[PDB]
Amino acid sequence: TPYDYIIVGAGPGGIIAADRLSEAGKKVLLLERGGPSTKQTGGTYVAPWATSSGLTKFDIPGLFESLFTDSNPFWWCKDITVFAGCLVGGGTSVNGALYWYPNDGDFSSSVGWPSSWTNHAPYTSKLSSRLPSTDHPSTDGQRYLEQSFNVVSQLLKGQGYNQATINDNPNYKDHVFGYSAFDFLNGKRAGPVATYLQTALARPNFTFKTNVMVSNVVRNGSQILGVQTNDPTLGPNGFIPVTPKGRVILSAGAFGTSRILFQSGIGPTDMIQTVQSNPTAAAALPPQNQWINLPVGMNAQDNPSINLVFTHPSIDAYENWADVWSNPRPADAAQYLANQSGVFAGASPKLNFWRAYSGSDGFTRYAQGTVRPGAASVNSSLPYNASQIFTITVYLSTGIQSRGRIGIDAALRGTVLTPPWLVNPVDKTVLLQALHDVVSNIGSIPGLTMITPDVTQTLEEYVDAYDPATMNSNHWVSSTTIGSSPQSAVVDSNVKVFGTNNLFIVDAGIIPHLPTGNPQGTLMSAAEQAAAKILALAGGP
Ligand SMILES: Cc1cc2c(nc3c(=O)[nH]c(=O)nc-3n2C[C@H](O)[C@H](O)[C@H](O)COP(=O)(O)OP(=O)(O)OC[C@H]2O[C@@H](n3cnc4c(N)ncnc43)[C@H](O)[C@@H]2O)c(O)c1C
Ligand SMILES: O=C1N[C@H](CO)[C@@H](O[C@@H]2O[C@H](CO)[C@@H](O)[C@H](O)[C@H]2O)[C@H](O)[C@H]1O
Ligand SMILES: *[C@@H]1O[C@H](CO)[C@@H](O)[C@H](O)[C@H]1NC(C)=O
Ligand SMILES: *[C@@H]1O[C@H](CO)[C@@H](O)[C@H](O)[C@H]1NC(C)=O
Ligand SMILES: *[C@@H]1O[C@H](CO)[C@@H](O)[C@H](O)[C@H]1NC(C)=O
Fold this sequence. Notes:
The protein has twelve helices and 19 strands. It is of the alpha/beta class.
């Protein structure tokens, strides 16, 4: 059975592409290597307390932190060394869900977008019609567990910040703070799974298959003939063809897509040779003379981040989220079960803030804070009251110059070959300035104490002793960046892979630089735009 589009990976990129292309009347197959996530996808991983609702760990926002503390987390991709979601929805089924509409600079030709992409408004608007921002996700309109917001707002107001409803004016971020915004609906996780996927699934020309892994595309030189999967019931020895004018879209995530390309003889020679080292994978490669040399996995960017941990007597650390699955506070559980209001209708973040920093190298960089009750890690030589802890996670985003590298190892695992954090010295300088500014007026808030790093350790000492791996912000972008030439990019303005007739990419890898805030809003706007460019590209099905 041939398809006009075969879309690999049911993450945000893939699902949006699948919806839009299927909406246009094209015969579309979406493939996903993992299984069900939320209730409506057939998921059954439900907390004891939540049983009657059928709402799973992925459905309930307040269960977010428990995605990291489960004894048996089947949702993480098992062959990637850093967090990636491998289930229906990808990262959007397991993420914090912080949702910021992209601003103009996020789509600027100055950060590497082609000119033809800079007018993101029509696409961003269109995104907002499917996934409206909310900073009060509880179905009663009220906000809950806000003590950390209240504390840090006072800190920030002393630093000259102003509060805003963040998504009302995306272009205005400097010295702004506000309640955390999410793409939730009816007090539950929503995202593309609850929207774009549902309108797709209603169409006779859309087919969705889960538990199917794509190893590689099959190609005759520049012409992609289809995909190779591990499911022999879908075609000869698992091969699924495209129609004659058909196209393959890769949306398997920064590590997923890069791996599929390497396994298809597309990417840096060192990576393809790594594939060739596995005799089985070697047999599926094109001959070496047809290998396409592109910077796949190069230019990898992720936010540097540093966690700062504090106590304040007004804080409610919510048992450090340790009990939300097996033994939640009865009133909170009851309230959520009844109508999906209360604590459980939001994830852990409560406050977000941003600040612009001039760069000695000419690049203006943005710092971002994400404030939540509780803390993953505490290193204090002094006693502290664990019921009073909260975290300020400080990131750099817009403007940073650091780049790393992702790829595969000899076992064909997606891995960080070169850590992308603080490669550029001016990025580190600005990060330390950003940290110093956050805590500059800590003494002006009575009872506010920084417990990691404690009083014995300076911010400079802390950053230098910090495990780089722990700086991972799960915001991988640019590993198959959009651009103008195969000398520095992997896809062109129509998100087509250089050197191919009909291979495309719609996932975070195409984004040329981190956006100002957490990236899923930027990605989803980009996916809308990508789908339009693909439909408008002549010679398609
Ligand atoms: C991992 C993670 C990510 C977070 C998180 N938090 C936020 C947040 O709060 N807000 C935000 O903006 N971004 C957040 N991010 C980032 C955001 O979720 C990601 O940037 C975003 O989901 C990336 O979308 P992509 O389309 O590039 O890729 P995904 O990994 O989401 O999806 C790929 C999918 O394809 C699949 N797939 C992969 N390889 C495949 C193969 N070979 N065959 C078939 N399917 C495959 C997957 O199983 C998966 O479903 C976070 O808490 C975690 C733990
Ligand atoms: O965009 C994001 N948003 C979410 C929400 O801010 C972050 O969640 C954090 O993710 C960390 C893991 O990366 C956890 O250890 C930590 O407890 C958790 O709060 C996540 O790291 C980040 O990628
Ligand atoms: C590759 O495709 C070209 C052009 O369609 C064709 O001439 C050739 O026979 C194909 N090669 C193989 C091995 O099928
Ligand atoms: C810990 O902090 C909480 C909230 O401030 C307070 O209720 C509790 O009594 C504190 N415990 C101790 C040891 O004082
Ligand atoms: C943990 O804190 C101690 C002081 O309490 C400090 O000397 C040590 O370096 C810290 N560890 C790290 C890795 O930052």
